[PDB]
Design a protein around this ligand. Structure first.
Ligand SMILES: Nc1nc2c(ncn2[C@@H]2O[C@H](COP(=O)(O)OP(=O)(O)O)[C@@H](O)[C@H]2O)c(=O)[nH]1
Ligand SMILES: [Mg+2]
Length: 167
């Protein structure tokens, strides 16, 4: 104290895996039916590029309320499910809401295509995910909360993005 601390916010539809990713990150356990309504906060002490960081993570479940957690958010995971086209299309809305709240033309965010383990149920291709990330000028990562693919990496990379914005 003063210590490096980051308020990270996980946003997205609609059963995309916001809770599963968060709980995998914090506890290394995969939750299969986590109450979809529950919005809660978690903390993890990490070492990223050899530098200590406390990550405070809001697992979200539009108006003043959401505007406020967007206002204080230092970085955002924009999550969709690769098996849910609707959730993919919703990403546009989230990014626009965040930039409106921030009154900025860019802000630390990463696009996450979750449920990549369900390779024969995909409604969104990896190429389509990469194209969306290009349009939004953000980093894209595919993940799976179920097999714990790119879970730590997604959160670490968001911190890297925040740090690069502060360089
Ligand atoms: N197969 C698979 N299922 C997932 C994955 N992530 C979440 N789920 C499942 O999808 C459902 C919704 O996940 P959840 O984390 O509650 O979604 P949220 O509403 O965005 O918080 C649950 O049944 C989870 O087990 C994943 O990477 N792969
Ligand atoms: Mg949830």
């Amino acid at each position: 104290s003063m210590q490096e601390k980051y308020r990270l916010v996980v946003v997205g539809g609609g059963g995309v895996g916001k809770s599963a990713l968060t709980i995998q990150f914090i506890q290394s356990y995969f939750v299969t039916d986590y109450d979809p309504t529950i919005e809660d906060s978690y903390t993890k002490q990490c070492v990223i590029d050899d530098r200590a960081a406390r990550l405070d993570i809001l697992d979200t479940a539009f108006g003043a309320m959401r505007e406020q957690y967007m206002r204080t958010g230092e970085g955002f995971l924009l999550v969709f499910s690769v098996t849910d086209r609707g959730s993919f299309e919703e990403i546009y809305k989230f990014q626009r809401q965040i930039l409106r709240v921030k009154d900025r033309d860019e802000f630390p965010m990463i696009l996450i295509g979750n449920k990549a383990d369900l390779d024969h149920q995909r409604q969104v291709t990896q190429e389509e995910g990469q194209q969306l990330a290009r349009q939004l000028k953000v980093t894209y990562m595919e993940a799976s909360a179920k097999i714990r693919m790119n879970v730590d990496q997604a959160f670490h990379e968001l911190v890297r993005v925040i740090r690069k914005f502060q360089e």
